[PDB]
Amino acid sequence: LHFDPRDHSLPFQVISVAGTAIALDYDRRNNRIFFTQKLNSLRGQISYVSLYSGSSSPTVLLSNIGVTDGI
C-alpha cells in the first residue's frame, strides 16, 4: 500500500503464504520481510520472502513454535 491515499497502484503483487500470517518486519539489507504464520491455533512458523521478486517464494526459518503475535 502506498502512503499516498490518492495513489491506487500496488507497490508489489500480493504474496500468497501458508496458514494465516500475523506480524511483519522488513530487512533493508536483503530486501526480505519476516512474518509469523499461525496454523491450527496451536502451531506457528517464522518465514521470510524476498522482495527482489525473480519468482521468489516464502521459506521457513523456524517451526513448531505456536501462536506468535510479534516480530
Partner 1 sequence: XXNXX
Ligand X SMILES: *[C@@H]1O[C@H](CO)[C@@H](O)[C@H](O[C@@H]2O[C@H](CO)[C@@H](O)[C@H](O)[C@H]2NC(C)=O)[C@H]1NC(C)=O
The full DSSP string for the chain is --S-TT----SSPPPP-SSEEEEEEEETTTTEEEEEEEETTTEEEEEEEETT-TT---EEEE-S-------
Output the smallest distance, CB 46 to ligand X, in A. 16
31 binds ligand X (CB under 6 A): no
Size of the site for ligand X (CB under 6 A): 2
Give the nearer residue to partner 1 in terms of CB position, either 2 or 24: 24
Output the smallest distance, CB 22 to partner 1, in A. 5
